[PDB]
Each structure stands twice: as structure tokens, then as C-alpha cells.
């Protein structure tokens, strides 16, 4: 197994996947690494299993259809993985914890959002459809763009949103387009 966490790329107290060489800190994995379970399979392995059991699940889909899906176990897992893929980028640090807004010439967003809040929301099964999760994720970056205006810091939002959007298209097998 790897000797660094797959998400944050640091050593420490790591849990090792039994079906692939990845390792995780307890609260870096999403959901948090389970108490017992020997063997244990990580979320990357669990996602690959879904695909393997239903090869047709990788044919293209319309975003509009994906968003209206109910958060049954498999969609819950896909949203967990997509959230994890965002945390995998080191630039997610800017969006993890609760922000605050005091900048000359800007007003804070009406509805603040951050990755740890989305994490909690998923953990507490507060989303009923994929749309719920995707709207909150997109809101994070949209709030950032709006608040930072012409400061070049706005680009961190563009960057992290691109990681989100690419992973969304991949994980939910959105139909490729020009
Ligand atoms: Zn970690
Ligand atoms: Zn694994
Ligand atoms: Zn089948």
C-alpha cells in the first residue's frame, strides 16, 4: 500500500485499502473510514465495482436526468466520491471551512457554502436528489467569483470548479459534447 494519504498526500495514521494500494486518513476518506470491516474496500474500489456490475452505466447521460435522480445508495456514493475528488486538489483548502466576508467594495453572499458543510449534509442524508448536492457545490464557486470580483483571487474559484465539473462529467458519465 501507499505510505501517504490519497486525498491530502501526507503521512500519518493511515488506513489501507484491501483491494487497491491506496491509503487514507480516517476523515480524509468519504465516508470516514469504517470502524471494523476486514477486508475494507475504499471508495475508489466501490465506485469501480458499480461500473463493473453495470457496464451500461458508462453510456452517456443528460445532466438534466442525472440531477433529478433520487439519492439512493449508489447516487449517495457517487456524490461522496465526487466530493472526495475535490478535496484531492490542494486548492480545496480555500473552500473547506466556513468563510467570512469583509472586503471594501463587496458584500458577502446571501447563502454562504463550503465543502465541510456539504460533507456534513451528505453524512446526515440531507440531500434527496443529486441536484441538491450539485447546486450547493456550484454555489461555493459562484459565491467566490461574485465576492472577489476583479481580484485575481477569483481564479481559485474557476480552478476548483473545473476540477468539480470534470469529475462530475466522469463520475456520472455525462454525454460528451463540443
Ligand atoms: Zn489525508
Ligand atoms: Zn481501494
Ligand atoms: Zn448488467
Amino acid at each position: 500500500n501507499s505510505n501517504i494519504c490519497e486525498v491530502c498526500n501526507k503521512w500519518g495514521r493511515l488506513f489501507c485499502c484491501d483491494t487497491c494500494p491506496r491509503s487514507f486518513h480516517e476523515h480524509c476518506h468519504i465516508p470516514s473510514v469504517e470502524a471494523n470491516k476486514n477486508p475494507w474496500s475504499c471508495i475508489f474500489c466501490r465506485i469501480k465495482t458499480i461500473q463493473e456490475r453495470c457496464p451500461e452505466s458508462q453510456s452517456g447521460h443528460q445532466e438534466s436526468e442525472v440531477l433529478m435522480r433520487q439519492m439512493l445508495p449508489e447516487e449517495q456514493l457517487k456524490c461522496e466520491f465526487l466530493l472526495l475528488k475535490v478535496y484531492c486538489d490542494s486548492k480545496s483548502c480555500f473552500f473547506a471551512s466556513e468563510p467570512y466576508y469583509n472586503r471594501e467594495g463587496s458584500q458577502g453572499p446571501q447563502k454562504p457554502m463550503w465543502l465541510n458543510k456539504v460533507k456534513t449534509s451528505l453524512n446526515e442524508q440531507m440531500y434527496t436528489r443529486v441536484e441538491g448536492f450539485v447546486q450547493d457545490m456550484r454555489l461555493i464557486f459562484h459565491n467566490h467569483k461574485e465576492f472577489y470580483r476583479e481580484d485575481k483571487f477569483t481564479r481559485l474559484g474557476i480552478q476548483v470548479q473545473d476540477i468539480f465539473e470534470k469529475n462530475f462529467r466522469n463520475i456520472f458519465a455525462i454525454q460528451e459534447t463540443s
Side-chain angles (χ1 to χ4, degrees), residues 1-36 38-178:
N1 288 66
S2 186
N3 306 339
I4 56 171
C5 177
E6 184 80 359
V7 179
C8 75
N9 304 103
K10 297 288 192 288
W11 182 72
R13 180 62 195 106
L14 302 173
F15 302 85
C16 286
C17 184
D18 287 308
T19 46
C20 76
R22 300 172 172 94
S23 318
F24 303 83
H25 294 103
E26 176 163 22
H27 298 306
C28 283
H29 193 273
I30 306 181
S32 298
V33 171
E34 299 71 9
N36 209 288
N38 318 54
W40 180 74
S41 269
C42 82
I43 188 160
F44 295 79
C45 287
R46 297 167 65 189
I47 290 290
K48 178 205 308 309
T49 299
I50 304 318
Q51 279 167 21
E52 291 178 349
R53 289 175 161 160
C54 286
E56 70 271 34
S57 71
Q58 305 156 270
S59 296
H61 300 84
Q62 300 299 108
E63 184 173 304
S64 57
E65 177 268 320
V66 167
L67 296 185
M68 291 311 303
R69 294 179 191 168
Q70 295 182 9
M71 292 277 263
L72 294 182
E74 291 191 346
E75 303 315 301
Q76 177 72 33
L77 195 80
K78 288 181 169 209
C79 289
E80 293 163 351
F81 189 52
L82 173 48
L83 180 55
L84 175 134
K85 287 293 198 137
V86 172
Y87 281 104
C88 290
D89 198 279
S90 63
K91 290 156 182 286
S92 71
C93 72
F94 296 110
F95 303 103
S97 81
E98 182 176 2
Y100 66 83
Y101 299 97
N102 196 0
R103 188 194 185 242
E104 181 176 336
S106 295
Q107 267 302 325
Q110 302 299 306
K111 182 181 176 188
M113 193 46 63
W114 58 101
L115 298 167
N116 293 348
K117 189 180 170 52
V118 177
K119 181 176 294 199
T120 291
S121 299
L122 272 170
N123 180 245
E124 289 177 2
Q125 299 155 309
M126 300 290 296
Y127 298 116
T128 56
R129 289 172 199 272
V130 176
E131 188 179 41
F133 164 81
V134 171
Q135 284 170 342
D136 279 353
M137 294 291 287
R138 287 175 175 165
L139 184 63
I140 296 169
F141 314 116
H142 187 257
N143 285 347
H144 177 100
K145 285 167 83 171
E146 290 309 293
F147 181 73
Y148 289 106
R149 306 286 203 96
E150 310 304 284
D151 198 300
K152 67 187 167 172
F153 193 58
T154 66
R155 175 165 180 264
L156 272 296
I158 292 164
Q159 292 173 322
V160 189
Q161 183 159 22
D162 196 47
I163 295 298
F164 175 71
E165 292 299 342
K166 281 184 197 271
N167 279 283
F168 172 69
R169 288 191 309 264
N170 182 256
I171 291 168
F172 287 93
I174 297 294
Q175 178 49 55
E176 289 274 293
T177 57
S178 41

